[PDB]
Amino acid sequence: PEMVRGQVFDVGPRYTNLSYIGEGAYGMVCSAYDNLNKVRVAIKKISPFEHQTYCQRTLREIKILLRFRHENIIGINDIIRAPTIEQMKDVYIVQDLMETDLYKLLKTQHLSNDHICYFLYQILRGLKYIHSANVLHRDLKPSNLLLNTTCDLKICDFGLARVADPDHDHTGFLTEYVATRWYRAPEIMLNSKGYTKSIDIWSVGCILAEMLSNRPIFPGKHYLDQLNHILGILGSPSQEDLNCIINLKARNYLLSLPHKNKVPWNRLFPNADSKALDLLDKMLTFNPHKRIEVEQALAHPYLEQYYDPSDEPIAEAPFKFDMELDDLPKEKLKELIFEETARFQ
Ligand SMILES: O=C1NCCn2cc(-c3ccnc(NC4CCOCC4)n3)cc21
């Protein structure tokens, strides 16, 4: 029973030579050698049966990643768990080992325009597949973008993912949100539940600004401060942008603010490619209805050396509806996780 620094990692005999990677709200990740495929892999240990929320996230991810098959999306090679529902306390997700992530890379490395261009193309190609399956990632950020030595990119962590539900997206002002603050679209704080595809596009726009300068574009220190950073760059929303905001608390908050001028992209990023800044502007549009869609972003002149619609595949079977796991307790979801992972036994 290998132990990765004070913790049980029961993955053998197939997985040996274990070394710690990271840890978080997704469980704990480690590297290990696979004696069957003769290569090193990544193993994610999840213990979700204590909390119902963790049961949802585990099932969500397993279900999505098992259906998805795409070069720019991390696959699941194996799932390790106990032979019975009674003995099952943990779930181990085995994935292809990646060398690093874009969060770690941006902390120490300046990217050339060619690297920015290629990484962005890959994000969008993976995102086109995700959205074609009617799925929203909802937590796109540099630590969820994995890379290898040849600059291949894979989107990981679908724990917070949901099936798109545009008809049920409206909500009140300052309504609680789970996804990472710096990459949150402005509508999240105003009137949106984050149930539309446009929320992922905003996150990609933030990632692009981050690749251009090695600094987050909207580094809010807390929740309402996020919207101050966004408005501090985009300027005051137009009358037309405000007409889409019909709940009065959000509307009157925006109207109460002093007039702010848009900070031009060329001043924020004076070394950036003019086409990169034109695409950035379209992804970081205040109005989510006017915001560029994934297929238009792929067709933008900035990505013309890579744009090939016949080599940008879509999902064969989209997810019809969102799984009603909001009220299902940790026991019915334990049986669904057990059934979903049966194939790997
Ligand atoms: O689902 C996940 N939640 C968030 C964290 N996370 C990482 C992975 C993962 C998968 C395959 N390889 C690697 N390699 C690492 C990348 C970082 O730098 C060291 C090597 N990481 C999957 C997840």
GROMACS .gro file of C-alpha atoms and ligand atoms in nm:
model
  368
    1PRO     CA    1   0.000   0.000   0.000
    2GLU     CA    2   0.227   0.277  -0.130
    3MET     CA    3   0.210   0.599   0.069
    4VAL     CA    4   0.264   0.940  -0.089
    5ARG     CA    5   0.378   1.149   0.206
    6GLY     CA    6   0.130   1.065   0.481
    7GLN     CA    7  -0.151   0.916   0.275
    8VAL     CA    8  -0.261   0.584   0.128
    9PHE     CA    9  -0.228   0.535  -0.248
   10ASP     CA   10  -0.354   0.185  -0.323
   11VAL     CA   11  -0.276   0.153  -0.694
   12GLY     CA   12  -0.042  -0.146  -0.731
   13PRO     CA   13   0.057  -0.384  -0.857
   14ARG     CA   14   0.019  -0.209  -1.200
   15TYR     CA   15   0.134   0.130  -1.060
   16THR     CA   16   0.472   0.165  -0.874
   17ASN     CA   17   0.759   0.429  -0.826
   18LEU     CA   18   0.516   0.696  -0.687
   19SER     CA   19   0.609   1.069  -0.663
   20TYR     CA   20   0.394   1.363  -0.535
   21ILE     CA   21   0.259   1.623  -0.788
   22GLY     CA   22  -0.001   1.845  -0.618
   23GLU     CA   23  -0.320   1.855  -0.412
   24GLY     CA   24  -0.646   2.048  -0.394
   25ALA     CA   25  -1.025   2.056  -0.394
   26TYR     CA   26  -1.012   1.792  -0.666
   27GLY     CA   27  -0.834   1.538  -0.448
   28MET     CA   28  -0.464   1.451  -0.469
   29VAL     CA   29  -0.248   1.395  -0.777
   30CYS     CA   30   0.070   1.186  -0.810
   31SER     CA   31   0.302   1.043  -1.076
   32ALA     CA   32   0.368   0.663  -1.105
   33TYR     CA   33   0.517   0.405  -1.344
   34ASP     CA   34   0.265   0.183  -1.533
   35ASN     CA   35   0.421  -0.168  -1.560
   36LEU     CA   36   0.173  -0.272  -1.839
   37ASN     CA   37   0.236   0.021  -2.086
   38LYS     CA   38   0.598   0.075  -1.962
   39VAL     CA   39   0.555   0.457  -1.912
   40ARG     CA   40   0.494   0.703  -1.624
   41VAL     CA   41   0.133   0.825  -1.560
   42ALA     CA   42  -0.064   1.068  -1.344
   43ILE     CA   43  -0.299   0.934  -1.073
   44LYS     CA   44  -0.570   1.144  -0.907
   45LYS     CA   45  -0.699   1.016  -0.568
   46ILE     CA   46  -1.055   1.135  -0.495
   47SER     CA   47  -1.237   1.062  -0.160
   48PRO     CA   48  -1.590   1.197  -0.236
   49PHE     CA   49  -1.831   0.973  -0.041
   50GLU     CA   50  -1.813   1.195   0.277
   51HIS     CA   51  -1.978   1.500   0.098
   52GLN     CA   52  -2.266   1.500  -0.160
   53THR     CA   53  -2.103   1.794  -0.352
   54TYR     CA   54  -1.782   1.590  -0.399
   55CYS     CA   55  -1.997   1.289  -0.521
   56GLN     CA   56  -2.147   1.513  -0.793
   57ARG     CA   57  -1.809   1.644  -0.910
   58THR     CA   58  -1.653   1.295  -0.921
   59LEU     CA   59  -1.945   1.153  -1.118
   60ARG     CA   60  -1.956   1.457  -1.346
   61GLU     CA   61  -1.590   1.428  -1.437
   62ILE     CA   62  -1.581   1.050  -1.477
   63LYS     CA   63  -1.896   1.059  -1.699
   64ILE     CA   64  -1.762   1.339  -1.923
   65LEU     CA   65  -1.399   1.226  -1.960
   66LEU     CA   66  -1.514   0.869  -2.041
   67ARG     CA   67  -1.733   0.993  -2.329
   68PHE     CA   68  -1.483   1.252  -2.463
   69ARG     CA   69  -1.204   1.152  -2.705
   70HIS     CA   70  -0.995   1.450  -2.821
   71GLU     CA   71  -0.622   1.534  -2.861
   72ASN     CA   72  -0.662   1.860  -2.655
   73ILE     CA   73  -0.862   1.704  -2.370
   74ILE     CA   74  -0.707   1.477  -2.101
   75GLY     CA   75  -0.837   1.118  -2.135
   76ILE     CA   76  -0.893   0.861  -1.860
   77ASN     CA   77  -0.669   0.554  -1.917
   78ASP     CA   78  -0.780   0.366  -1.599
   79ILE     CA   79  -0.995   0.396  -1.284
   80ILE     CA   80  -0.889   0.215  -0.966
   81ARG     CA   81  -1.132   0.138  -0.683
   82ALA     CA   82  -1.220  -0.146  -0.440
   83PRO     CA   83  -1.402  -0.458  -0.580
   84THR     CA   84  -1.723  -0.379  -0.381
   85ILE     CA   85  -1.935  -0.073  -0.295
   86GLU     CA   86  -1.884  -0.164   0.079
   87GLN     CA   87  -1.501  -0.154   0.055
   88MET     CA   88  -1.496   0.155  -0.178
   89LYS     CA   89  -1.374   0.468   0.010
   90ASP     CA   90  -1.151   0.623  -0.265
   91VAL     CA   91  -1.141   0.649  -0.645
   92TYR     CA   92  -0.814   0.667  -0.841
   93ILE     CA   93  -0.822   0.830  -1.189
   94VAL     CA   94  -0.524   0.732  -1.413
   95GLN     CA   95  -0.426   0.982  -1.689
   96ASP     CA   96  -0.140   1.032  -1.939
   97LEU     CA   97   0.140   1.214  -1.756
   98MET     CA   98   0.196   1.573  -1.869
   99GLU     CA   99   0.518   1.762  -1.796
  100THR     CA  100   0.369   2.088  -1.666
  101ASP     CA  101   0.077   2.331  -1.675
  102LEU     CA  102   0.042   2.683  -1.819
  103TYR     CA  103   0.012   2.828  -1.458
  104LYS     CA  104   0.369   2.701  -1.372
  105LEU     CA  105   0.501   2.798  -1.722
  106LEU     CA  106   0.371   3.161  -1.704
  107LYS     CA  107   0.529   3.207  -1.355
  108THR     CA  108   0.883   3.171  -1.505
  109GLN     CA  109   0.870   3.180  -1.890
  110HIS     CA  110   0.814   3.453  -2.146
  111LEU     CA  111   0.615   3.316  -2.445
  112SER     CA  112   0.698   3.404  -2.807
  113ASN     CA  113   0.402   3.512  -3.025
  114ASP     CA  114   0.424   3.167  -3.202
  115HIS     CA  115   0.380   2.985  -2.862
  116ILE     CA  116   0.085   3.216  -2.768
  117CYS     CA  117  -0.070   3.148  -3.111
  118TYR     CA  118  -0.024   2.767  -3.090
  119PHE     CA  119  -0.142   2.736  -2.723
  120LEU     CA  120  -0.450   2.951  -2.797
  121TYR     CA  121  -0.534   2.746  -3.107
  122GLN     CA  122  -0.523   2.425  -2.900
  123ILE     CA  123  -0.741   2.569  -2.618
  124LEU     CA  124  -1.004   2.674  -2.874
  125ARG     CA  125  -0.988   2.339  -3.064
  126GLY     CA  126  -1.044   2.153  -2.732
  127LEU     CA  127  -1.316   2.409  -2.635
  128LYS     CA  128  -1.492   2.363  -2.975
  129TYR     CA  129  -1.522   1.986  -2.900
  130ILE     CA  130  -1.649   2.050  -2.536
  131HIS     CA  131  -1.916   2.307  -2.650
  132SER     CA  132  -2.023   2.084  -2.944
  133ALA     CA  133  -2.112   1.818  -2.675
  134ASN     CA  134  -2.333   2.092  -2.514
  135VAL     CA  135  -2.088   2.094  -2.216
  136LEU     CA  136  -1.949   2.402  -2.030
  137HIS     CA  137  -1.613   2.356  -1.858
  138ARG     CA  138  -1.680   2.651  -1.613
  139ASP     CA  139  -1.328   2.645  -1.460
  140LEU     CA  140  -1.088   2.727  -1.746
  141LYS     CA  141  -0.766   2.881  -1.605
  142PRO     CA  142  -0.385   2.825  -1.662
  143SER     CA  143  -0.357   2.545  -1.394
  144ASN     CA  144  -0.624   2.344  -1.588
  145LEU     CA  145  -0.419   2.363  -1.911
  146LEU     CA  146  -0.155   2.083  -1.920
  147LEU     CA  147   0.150   2.083  -2.147
  148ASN     CA  148   0.424   1.843  -2.257
  149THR     CA  149   0.783   1.917  -2.396
  150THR     CA  150   0.656   1.950  -2.754
  151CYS     CA  151   0.406   2.219  -2.655
  152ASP     CA  152   0.101   1.994  -2.688
  153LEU     CA  153  -0.188   2.120  -2.477
  154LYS     CA  154  -0.463   1.930  -2.292
  155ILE     CA  155  -0.765   2.070  -2.099
  156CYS     CA  156  -0.811   1.893  -1.763
  157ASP     CA  157  -1.050   1.898  -1.457
  158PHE     CA  158  -1.420   1.873  -1.556
  159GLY     CA  159  -1.528   1.857  -1.187
  160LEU     CA  160  -1.723   2.187  -1.211
  161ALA     CA  161  -1.858   2.116  -1.565
  162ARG     CA  162  -2.230   2.131  -1.654
  163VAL     CA  163  -2.463   2.072  -1.949
  164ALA     CA  164  -2.549   2.411  -2.108
  165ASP     CA  165  -2.890   2.550  -2.000
  166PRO     CA  166  -2.934   2.899  -2.157
  167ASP     CA  167  -3.311   2.915  -2.078
  168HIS     CA  168  -3.231   2.887  -1.701
  169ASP     CA  169  -2.929   3.126  -1.686
  170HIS     CA  170  -3.090   3.437  -1.521
  171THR     CA  171  -3.033   3.516  -1.151
  172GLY     CA  172  -3.004   3.812  -0.911
  173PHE     CA  173  -2.720   4.052  -0.831
  174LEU     CA  174  -2.410   3.920  -0.638
  175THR     CA  175  -2.539   3.555  -0.631
  176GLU     CA  176  -2.275   3.303  -0.502
  177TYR     CA  177  -2.035   3.135  -0.749
  178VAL     CA  178  -1.791   2.836  -0.738
  179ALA     CA  179  -1.551   2.898  -1.043
  180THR     CA  180  -1.209   3.079  -1.008
  181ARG     CA  181  -1.247   3.457  -0.946
  182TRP     CA  182  -0.983   3.605  -1.188
  183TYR     CA  183  -1.144   3.416  -1.486
  184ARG     CA  184  -1.509   3.495  -1.401
  185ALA     CA  185  -1.716   3.668  -1.667
  186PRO     CA  186  -1.877   4.004  -1.545
  187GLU     CA  187  -2.236   3.866  -1.592
  188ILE     CA  188  -2.163   3.610  -1.306
  189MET     CA  189  -2.167   3.900  -1.054
  190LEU     CA  190  -2.469   4.067  -1.220
  191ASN     CA  191  -2.741   3.832  -1.350
  192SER     CA  192  -2.601   3.499  -1.477
  193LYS     CA  193  -2.570   3.149  -1.328
  194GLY     CA  194  -2.291   3.062  -1.581
  195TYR     CA  195  -2.511   2.819  -1.783
  196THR     CA  196  -2.412   2.957  -2.128
  197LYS     CA  197  -2.111   2.885  -2.355
  198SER     CA  198  -2.010   3.256  -2.339
  199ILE     CA  199  -1.873   3.204  -1.979
  200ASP     CA  200  -1.592   2.971  -2.115
  201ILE     CA  201  -1.501   3.226  -2.389
  202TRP     CA  202  -1.449   3.499  -2.123
  203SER     CA  203  -1.207   3.258  -1.934
  204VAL     CA  204  -1.014   3.194  -2.258
  205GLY     CA  205  -0.984   3.577  -2.315
  206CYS     CA  206  -0.839   3.612  -1.962
  207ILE     CA  207  -0.590   3.325  -2.037
  208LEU     CA  208  -0.486   3.498  -2.363
  209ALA     CA  209  -0.425   3.831  -2.179
  210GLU     CA  210  -0.220   3.628  -1.925
  211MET     CA  211  -0.003   3.458  -2.198
  212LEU     CA  212   0.068   3.807  -2.341
  213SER     CA  213   0.203   3.964  -2.017
  214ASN     CA  214   0.270   3.683  -1.757
  215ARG     CA  215   0.022   3.858  -1.520
  216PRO     CA  216  -0.355   3.803  -1.467
  217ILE     CA  217  -0.551   4.078  -1.647
  218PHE     CA  218  -0.828   4.111  -1.377
  219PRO     CA  219  -0.666   4.021  -1.040
  220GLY     CA  220  -0.962   4.082  -0.805
  221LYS     CA  221  -0.855   4.047  -0.437
  222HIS     CA  222  -1.213   3.931  -0.342
  223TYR     CA  223  -1.570   3.880  -0.500
  224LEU     CA  224  -1.716   4.241  -0.577
  225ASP     CA  225  -1.360   4.374  -0.645
  226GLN     CA  226  -1.357   4.138  -0.952
  227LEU     CA  227  -1.616   4.356  -1.133
  228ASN     CA  228  -1.416   4.676  -1.042
  229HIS     CA  229  -1.105   4.529  -1.221
  230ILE     CA  230  -1.314   4.432  -1.529
  231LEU     CA  231  -1.489   4.775  -1.550
  232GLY     CA  232  -1.152   4.944  -1.475
  233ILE     CA  233  -1.025   4.811  -1.815
  234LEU     CA  234  -1.339   4.774  -2.032
  235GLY     CA  235  -1.486   5.106  -1.917
  236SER     CA  236  -1.852   5.187  -1.843
  237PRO     CA  237  -2.098   4.955  -2.025
  238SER     CA  238  -2.298   5.120  -2.306
  239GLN     CA  239  -2.680   5.185  -2.282
  240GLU     CA  240  -2.724   4.879  -2.516
  241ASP     CA  241  -2.512   4.658  -2.277
  242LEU     CA  242  -2.729   4.781  -1.981
  243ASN     CA  243  -3.062   4.695  -2.162
  244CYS     CA  244  -2.973   4.321  -2.126
  245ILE     CA  245  -2.937   4.375  -1.744
  246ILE     CA  246  -3.303   4.383  -1.625
  247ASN     CA  247  -3.273   4.299  -1.254
  248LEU     CA  248  -3.275   4.642  -1.090
  249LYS     CA  249  -3.009   4.581  -0.823
  250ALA     CA  250  -2.740   4.506  -1.092
  251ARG     CA  251  -2.873   4.781  -1.324
  252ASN     CA  252  -2.878   5.047  -1.054
  253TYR     CA  253  -2.530   4.943  -0.927
  254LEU     CA  254  -2.379   4.997  -1.278
  255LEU     CA  255  -2.573   5.329  -1.322
  256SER     CA  256  -2.445   5.453  -0.979
  257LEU     CA  257  -2.081   5.426  -1.091
  258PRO     CA  258  -1.878   5.722  -1.228
  259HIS     CA  259  -1.803   5.717  -1.603
  260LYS     CA  260  -1.485   5.508  -1.672
  261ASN     CA  261  -1.298   5.512  -2.001
  262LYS     CA  262  -1.187   5.195  -2.180
  263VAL     CA  263  -0.811   5.129  -2.136
  264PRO     CA  264  -0.689   5.053  -2.497
  265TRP     CA  265  -0.543   4.699  -2.548
  266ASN     CA  266  -0.234   4.847  -2.726
  267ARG     CA  267  -0.145   5.043  -2.407
  268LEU     CA  268  -0.189   4.737  -2.179
  269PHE     CA  269   0.009   4.509  -2.421
  270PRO     CA  270   0.250   4.725  -2.633
  271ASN     CA  271   0.455   4.419  -2.752
  272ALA     CA  272   0.149   4.213  -2.858
  273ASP     CA  273   0.056   4.118  -3.216
  274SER     CA  274  -0.225   4.351  -3.342
  275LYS     CA  275  -0.435   4.049  -3.456
  276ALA     CA  276  -0.395   3.888  -3.106
  277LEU     CA  277  -0.533   4.214  -2.949
  278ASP     CA  278  -0.824   4.222  -3.199
  279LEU     CA  279  -0.921   3.864  -3.095
  280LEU     CA  280  -0.869   3.951  -2.726
  281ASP     CA  281  -1.120   4.242  -2.759
  282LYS     CA  282  -1.385   4.010  -2.903
  283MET     CA  283  -1.340   3.746  -2.626
  284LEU     CA  284  -1.343   4.008  -2.349
  285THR     CA  285  -1.668   4.177  -2.458
  286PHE     CA  286  -1.885   4.293  -2.161
  287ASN     CA  287  -2.211   4.180  -2.330
  288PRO     CA  288  -2.219   3.795  -2.342
  289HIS     CA  289  -2.457   3.796  -2.644
  290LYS     CA  290  -2.207   4.008  -2.845
  291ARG     CA  291  -1.906   3.799  -2.722
  292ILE     CA  292  -1.725   3.590  -2.992
  293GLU     CA  293  -1.824   3.214  -3.019
  294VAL     CA  294  -1.560   2.933  -3.023
  295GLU     CA  295  -1.598   2.864  -3.400
  296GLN     CA  296  -1.560   3.236  -3.487
  297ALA     CA  297  -1.257   3.261  -3.257
  298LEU     CA  298  -1.099   2.967  -3.450
  299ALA     CA  299  -1.170   3.147  -3.783
  300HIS     CA  300  -1.006   3.474  -3.660
  301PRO     CA  301  -0.706   3.601  -3.870
  302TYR     CA  302  -0.476   3.566  -3.564
  303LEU     CA  303  -0.508   3.179  -3.593
  304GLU     CA  304  -0.501   3.154  -3.974
  305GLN     CA  305  -0.176   2.949  -3.990
  306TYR     CA  306  -0.354   2.668  -3.788
  307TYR     CA  307  -0.725   2.711  -3.885
  308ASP     CA  308  -0.848   2.389  -4.048
  309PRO     CA  309  -1.222   2.320  -3.979
  310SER     CA  310  -1.194   1.964  -4.115
  311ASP     CA  311  -0.920   1.900  -3.848
  312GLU     CA  312  -1.122   2.056  -3.560
  313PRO     CA  313  -1.359   1.770  -3.464
  314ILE     CA  314  -1.689   1.786  -3.280
  315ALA     CA  315  -1.846   1.530  -3.041
  316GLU     CA  316  -2.045   1.237  -3.186
  317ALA     CA  317  -2.287   1.225  -2.891
  318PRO     CA  318  -2.366   1.552  -2.707
  319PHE     CA  319  -2.500   1.541  -2.349
  320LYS     CA  320  -2.882   1.577  -2.386
  321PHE     CA  321  -2.961   1.699  -2.029
  322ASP     CA  322  -2.787   1.793  -1.699
  323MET     CA  323  -2.786   1.501  -1.450
  324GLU     CA  324  -3.029   1.574  -1.159
  325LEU     CA  325  -2.766   1.523  -0.883
  326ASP     CA  326  -2.856   1.840  -0.680
  327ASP     CA  327  -3.085   1.644  -0.438
  328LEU     CA  328  -2.944   1.285  -0.481
  329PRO     CA  329  -2.753   1.197  -0.157
  330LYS     CA  330  -2.397   1.054  -0.121
  331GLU     CA  331  -2.545   0.693  -0.135
  332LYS     CA  332  -2.729   0.692  -0.471
  333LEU     CA  333  -2.433   0.878  -0.628
  334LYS     CA  334  -2.191   0.618  -0.477
  335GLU     CA  335  -2.379   0.346  -0.677
  336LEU     CA  336  -2.359   0.556  -0.997
  337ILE     CA  337  -1.980   0.609  -0.949
  338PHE     CA  338  -1.944   0.227  -0.881
  339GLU     CA  339  -2.139   0.145  -1.203
  340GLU     CA  340  -1.953   0.408  -1.411
  341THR     CA  341  -1.613   0.262  -1.301
  342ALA     CA  342  -1.712  -0.115  -1.345
  343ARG     CA  343  -1.542  -0.145  -1.695
  344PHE     CA  344  -1.193  -0.092  -1.542
  345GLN     CA  345  -1.224  -0.390  -1.305
  346LIG     O1  346  -0.787   1.702  -1.274
  346LIG     C1  347  -0.694   1.768  -1.228
  346LIG     N1  348  -0.714   1.870  -1.143
  346LIG     C2  349  -0.621   1.983  -1.128
  346LIG     C3  350  -0.477   1.939  -1.125
  346LIG     N2  351  -0.454   1.831  -1.222
  346LIG     C4  352  -0.337   1.792  -1.277
  346LIG     C5  353  -0.356   1.686  -1.363
  346LIG     C6  354  -0.251   1.617  -1.439
  346LIG     C7  355  -0.279   1.512  -1.526
  346LIG     C8  356  -0.173   1.461  -1.598
  346LIG     N3  357  -0.046   1.504  -1.583
  346LIG     C9  358  -0.029   1.603  -1.494
  346LIG     N4  359   0.096   1.650  -1.478
  346LIG    C10  360   0.139   1.757  -1.387
  346LIG    C11  361   0.093   1.895  -1.433
  346LIG    C12  362   0.144   2.000  -1.337
  346LIG     O2  363   0.287   1.995  -1.325
  346LIG    C13  364   0.331   1.868  -1.275
  346LIG    C14  365   0.291   1.755  -1.367
  346LIG     N5  366  -0.126   1.663  -1.422
  346LIG    C15  367  -0.499   1.661  -1.360
  346LIG    C16  368  -0.555   1.749  -1.270
   0.00000   0.00000   0.00000
